[PDB]
Scaffold this active site. Structure first.
Site, PDB file in Angstrom:
ATOM      1  N   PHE A  91       0.806  -1.211   0.000  1.00 38.83           N
ATOM      2  CA  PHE A  91       0.000   0.000   0.000  1.00 38.83           C
ATOM      3  C   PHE A  91       0.843   1.268   0.000  1.00 38.83           C
ATOM      4  O   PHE A  91       0.562   2.213   0.732  1.00 38.83           O
ATOM      5  CB  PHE A  91      -0.962   0.006   1.181  1.00 38.83           C
ATOM      6  CG  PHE A  91      -1.746  -1.258   1.329  1.00 38.83           C
ATOM      7  CD1 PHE A  91      -2.381  -1.826   0.243  1.00 38.83           C
ATOM      8  CD2 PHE A  91      -1.863  -1.866   2.557  1.00 38.83           C
ATOM      9  CE1 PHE A  91      -3.104  -2.978   0.382  1.00 38.83           C
ATOM     10  CE2 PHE A  91      -2.588  -3.015   2.703  1.00 38.83           C
ATOM     11  CZ  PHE A  91      -3.212  -3.574   1.615  1.00 38.83           C
TER      12      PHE A  91
ATOM     13  N   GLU B 231       1.396  -2.140   6.392  1.00 37.34           N
ATOM     14  CA  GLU B 231       2.105  -2.222   5.119  1.00 37.34           C
ATOM     15  C   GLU B 231       2.103  -0.886   4.375  1.00 37.34           C
ATOM     16  O   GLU B 231       1.624  -0.768   3.253  1.00 37.34           O
ATOM     17  CB  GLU B 231       1.527  -3.329   4.244  1.00 37.34           C
ATOM     18  CG  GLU B 231       2.493  -4.449   4.037  1.00 37.34           C
ATOM     19  CD  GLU B 231       1.823  -5.677   3.537  1.00 37.34           C
ATOM     20  OE1 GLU B 231       0.617  -5.589   3.252  1.00 37.34           O
ATOM     21  OE2 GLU B 231       2.492  -6.725   3.426  1.00 37.34           O
ATOM     22  N   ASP B 232       2.702   0.103   5.033  1.00 40.46           N
ATOM     23  CA  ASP B 232       2.936   1.428   4.472  1.00 40.46           C
ATOM     24  C   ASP B 232       1.646   2.214   4.275  1.00 40.46           C
ATOM     25  O   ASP B 232       1.490   2.912   3.282  1.00 40.46           O
ATOM     26  CB  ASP B 232       3.707   1.350   3.151  1.00 40.46           C
ATOM     27  CG  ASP B 232       5.047   0.667   3.295  1.00 40.46           C
ATOM     28  OD1 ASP B 232       5.558   0.585   4.430  1.00 40.46           O
ATOM     29  OD2 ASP B 232       5.589   0.202   2.269  1.00 40.46           O
ATOM     30  N   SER B 233       0.710   2.114   5.202  1.00 42.55           N
ATOM     31  CA  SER B 233      -0.476   2.948   5.204  1.00 42.55           C
ATOM     32  C   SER B 233      -0.487   3.794   6.465  1.00 42.55           C
ATOM     33  O   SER B 233       0.214   3.503   7.434  1.00 42.55           O
ATOM     34  CB  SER B 233      -1.744   2.110   5.129  1.00 42.55           C
ATOM     35  OG  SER B 233      -1.528   0.943   4.386  1.00 42.55           O
TER      36      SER B 233
END
Ligand SMILES: [Mg+2]
Ligand SMILES: [Zn+2]
Lengths: 357, 48, 145, 80, 124, 56, 124
Positions: free
Chosen positions: C23, E54-56
């Site tokens: 994401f 996860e990269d949010s």
């Protein structure tokens, strides 16, 4: 007496500081306090669940009806708004967030500014003029806000600045109170300055087993008239209690019609002995879900399951109850729980009347 | 797949009461433990 | 998603292993079958439950990542800095109010009764009982001394 | 382009004191340096003056967010 | 950020002007020579329901409403004319062929839409 | 030029934050974009006339 | 897409109301919540030092310099926090905004400079 010992403390300017005094005097000819001040209110509650105290806090933050200044469409006069940096989006965002204390929606304001000089001129909120409604005896906003700045020879004209209503959950310009303190007074604490306890919260009980019933809550209100602090604070607290009572009564009016088929209430008979209820309320929040679950659990200590859900992408609250009774007995218990909620908040409002002079 | 989802909601709802963070102080050696790392490093540069 | 302010394709984090995605700005395509024949074979042939086991390696693909890996450890951990890793009936019931399964029964439990984390996990694994016995990643010979 | 009307993080109205704060900070830094050319005053040296008590005197609380946004916000009138 | 200080005098394509900017609380020597573009956001480093995996990130909606990282985006156009063949003006459907189907011609005054009107998909 | 003896220079109170002023001086003299305008000034002063007259 | 100055970039996935965000005992609440699992493999340790240093900067009222290759001492910077009334680690007691319950763990929360990257979801 559920809540006692309120403390109210306005935020005031210290004119003994020379630099602040000189800047205020030479910018606004201000030697006294401003007409509207922020007020810090610290309240102690006893014999009450944190579902109720936290629901009260949540409503006072962003679920209470509030007012803001907005611009009607076509009010930003493009023809004679010669300045190019002071766009409508920027100025509208500035104006939406000025805190006001307004008592009717009939007031209308206007901004008519010209820069007939050779320097950049600053627009302040004292430059808004009332053009409609009854004449104000007292201001509704402070005159010290910076709204914009005009390049030499430029102008900004905005008409039709009215008062809009809403709740801060939809747009944050309708937010009311900012959080300043929250704690439980019946749970002991470690000294967390010691590097032995600095990774821990500080409370001596886990939050998975503690059930505190003695709280201290502190909230700050952003803009209150100086001679009417106690009245304004009292009104805010009463309105929060009334909002909660209204929403609980909306759910109550659904519970009683369990004979007629309803899209908001579903009753199953899972077995020969167990009954299941599912309540789906559109646009409800964690306030009501948490309150309902806590009071249902207090009424039925030996229940099979109670739980609620507010999934962010569904915009609804779903409450599930599974109990070992018949449908009628379950509805009786649910009505009893809802009455307990209503009674608690009515006591809160009566105590507000007694405490704040 | 239905079990991965269900055990993932149990784990997430547990941490919404327990907490989990990381800080700058989590990566910091104690003053005496810093001198032990230097001694290990000097042994490598002595054998080198 | 009926919120009109959302423009993203949203998915569960445990589904990212099928597509090797994350994401930080990835884009994915999506088309909806409109034909009856293409709709039948989408559901019977091409559902993602058919790719749970890898064709390449013959092992499983999906599982927990990063929050459910460390949150499953914290849940089933025997001791907490506060003492035993237990919760009361209200908080044990609250762990299940999102699982979208059928809730368990807590009627033989009082408000002050305490439940260990391994007790709560068993209420979920009873539906699909299995046998398992290994040592965890937690136990390492490197850290043991 | 200005100091915001409210704190971006909590919503406290820091903007009712923004003009007083900007002028008072200018005067205070000038007092601390002692009458030096604006270019001969380094940008780094003036930012190391503590403005804790000036902000306290404005009546603004000890919140991290409010003081951050009151202290660090860039002014478009000083760059154009 | 403030991508240029003469944006209102320019007609650019795909340019973003961000209203509010801050000096970092921990600045470097590079901020003696360029304008900083960003904000001093308060960040909590924690697990909150699994939506930042996860990269949010999870954002405050109030922070968004108040103008954090808000600005204005620009698109330009350039339509040319032919000598004595083409001209600017509101087309007349009866004497003009091949009018674009379903297109809203009622916005046009004197050949161009006036300044300050919202254009939609399908509008001329 | 003769430079004074190196054994009588006071630098023991030089810090690493004092050394950033050298970088400040370098950038101030050079400018962030220095060569791009000097090169064009030379092209408009010494390159175009010489290349037009003495090459064709 | 947002990013910090250490190259840690991510997508905005959820936006919460004010009453739904976590808050500390003094009412501090974040603008952003970033996952701690974004740290250990990327090893962006300068972003955590910036939160430590800037937290004491905000209470002091100053802007300091964090240029690369200047001398640093994370031990002495963490003692500056304690001198300002905070904890050594810069972590605080926090509450869940949705239930009102406190975590059994102090949370690392503080100011970190962030940027909005010009990659807009409406365009793609
Ligand atoms: Mg990617
Ligand atoms: Zn604030």
């Amino acid at each position: 007496k559920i809540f006692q010992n309120v403390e109210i403390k306005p935020f005031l300017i210290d004119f003994s500081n020379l630099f602040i005094k000189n800047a205020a005097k030479k910018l606004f000819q201000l030697e006294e306090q401003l007409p509207l001040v922020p007020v810090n209110v610290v309240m102690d509650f006893k014999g009450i669940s944190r579902a109720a105290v936290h629901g009260l806090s949540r409503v006072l933050q962003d679920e209470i009806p509030n007012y803001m200044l907005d611009i009607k469409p076509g009010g930003y006069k493009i023809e004679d708004s010669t300045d190019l940096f002071m766009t409508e989006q920027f100025i509208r965002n500035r104006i939406n967030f000025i805190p006001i204390y307004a008592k009717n929606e009939t007031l209308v304001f206007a901004l008519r500014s010209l820069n007939n000089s050779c320097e950049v001129k600053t627009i302040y909120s004292r430059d808004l003029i009332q053009v409609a409604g009854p004449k104000l005896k007292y201001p509704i906003f402070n005159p010290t806000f910076e709204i914009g700045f005009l390049q030499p020879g430029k102008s900004l004209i905005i008409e039709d600045i009215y008062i809009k209503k809403g709740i801060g959950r939809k747009h944050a310009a309708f937010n009311l109170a900012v959080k300043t303190h929250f704690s439980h007074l019946d749970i002991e604490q470690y000294p967390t300055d010691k590097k032995e306890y600095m990774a821990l919260s500080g409370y001596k009980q886990s939050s998975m087993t503690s059930d505190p019933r003695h709280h201290r809550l502190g909230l700050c209100f952003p803009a209150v008239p100086l001679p009417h602090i106690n009245q304004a604070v009292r009104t805010y607290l009463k309105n929060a209690c009334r909002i909660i009572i209204g929403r609980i009564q909306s759910i109550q009016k659904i519970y009683e019609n369990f004979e007629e088929p309803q899209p908001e209430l579903v009753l199953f008979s899972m077995d020969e002995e167990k009954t299941k209820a599912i309540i789906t309320i559109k646009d409800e929040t964690h306030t009501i879900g948490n309150l309902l679950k806590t009071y249902i659990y207090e009424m039925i200590p030996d229940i099979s399951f109670v739980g609620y859900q507010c999934v962010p992408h569904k915009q609804e609250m779903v409450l599930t109850i599974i109990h070992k009774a018949s449908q009628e007995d379950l509805i009786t218990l649910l009505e009893k729980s809802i009455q307990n909620i209503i009674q608690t908040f009515q006591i809160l409002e009566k105590n507000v009347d007694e405490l704040i002079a | 797949l239905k079990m991965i989802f269900a055990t993932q909601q149990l784990a997430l709802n547990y941490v919404r009461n327990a907490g989990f963070t990381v800080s700058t102080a989590d990566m910091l050696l104690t003053p005496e433990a810093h001198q032990e790392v230097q001694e290990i490093i000097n042994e490598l540069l002595l054998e080198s | 998603l009926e919120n009109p302010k959302i423009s993203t394709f949203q998915m569960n984090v445990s589904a990212c292993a099928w597509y090797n995605a994350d994401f930080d700005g990835d884009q994915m395509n999506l088309w909806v079958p409109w034909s009856v024949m293409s709709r039948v074979e989408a559901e019977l042939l091409c559902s993602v439950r058919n790719w749970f086991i890898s064709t390449k390696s013959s092992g499983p693909v999906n599982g927990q990542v990063q929050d459910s890996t460390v949150g499953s450890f914290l849940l089933t951990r025997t001791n907490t800095p506060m003492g035993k890793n237990v919760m009361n009936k209200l908080h044990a019931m609250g762990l299940f109010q999102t699982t979208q399964t059928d809730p368990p029964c807590f009627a033989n439990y009082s408000p002050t009764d305490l439940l260990d984390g391994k007790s709560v996990v068993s209420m979920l694994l009873r539906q699909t009982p299995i046998n398992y016995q290994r040592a965890p990643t937690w136990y390492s010979e490197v850290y043991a001394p | 382009m200005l100091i915001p009307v409210v704190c971006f993080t909590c919503g406290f109205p820091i903007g009712t004191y923004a003009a007083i704060f900007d002028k008072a900070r200018t005067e205070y830094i000038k007092t601390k340096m002692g009458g030096t050319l604006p270019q001969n005053i380094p940008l780094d040296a003036s930012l190391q003056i503590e403005l804790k008590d000036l902000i306290t005197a404005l009546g603004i609380p000890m919140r991290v967010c409010c003081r951050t946004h009151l202290i660090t916000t860039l002014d478009y009138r000083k760059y154009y | 950020g403030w991508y240029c200080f003469s944006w209102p005098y320019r007609v650019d394509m795909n340019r973003f002007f961000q209203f509010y900017n801050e000096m970092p609380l921990v600045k470097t020597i590079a901020h003696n020579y360029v304008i900083p573009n960003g904000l001093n956001t308060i960040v909590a480093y924690m697990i909150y329901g699994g939506y930042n995996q996860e990269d949010s990130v999870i954002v405050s909606q109030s922070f968004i409403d108040r103008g954090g990282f808000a600005g204005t985006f620009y698109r330009e156009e350039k339509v040319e004319l032919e000598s004595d063949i083409e001209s600017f003006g509101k087309p007349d459907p009866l004497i003009t062929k091949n009018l674009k189907p379903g297109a809203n011609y009622e916005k046009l005054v004197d050949g161009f839409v006036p300044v300050g009107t919202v254009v939609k998909k399908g509008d001329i | 030029i003769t430079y004074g003896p190196i054994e009588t220079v006071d630098n023991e109170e030089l810090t690493e934050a004092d050394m950033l002023s050298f970088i400040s001086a370098a950038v101030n003299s050079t400018g962030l974009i220095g060569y791009n305008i000097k090169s064009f000034d030379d092209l408009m002063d010494n390159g175009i006339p010489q290349i037009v007259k003495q090459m064709f | 897409k947002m990013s910090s100055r250490s190259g840690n970039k991510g997508i905005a996935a959820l936006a919460l109301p004010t009453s739904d965000m976590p808050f500390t005992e003094d009412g501090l609440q974040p603008d952003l919540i970033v996952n701690p699992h974004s740290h250990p493999s990327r090893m962006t340790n300068g972003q955590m030092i910036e939160t430590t240093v800037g937290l004491a900067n905000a209470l002091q009222g100053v802007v300091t310099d964090g240029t690369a290759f200047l001398p640093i001492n994370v031990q002495l910077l963490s003692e500056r926090l304690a001198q300002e009334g905070l904890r050594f680690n810069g972590c605080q007691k926090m509450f869940n905004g949705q239930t009102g319950e406190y975590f059994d763990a102090a949370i690392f929360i503080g100011p970190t400079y962030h940027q909005r990257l010009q990659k807009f979801v409406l365009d793609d």
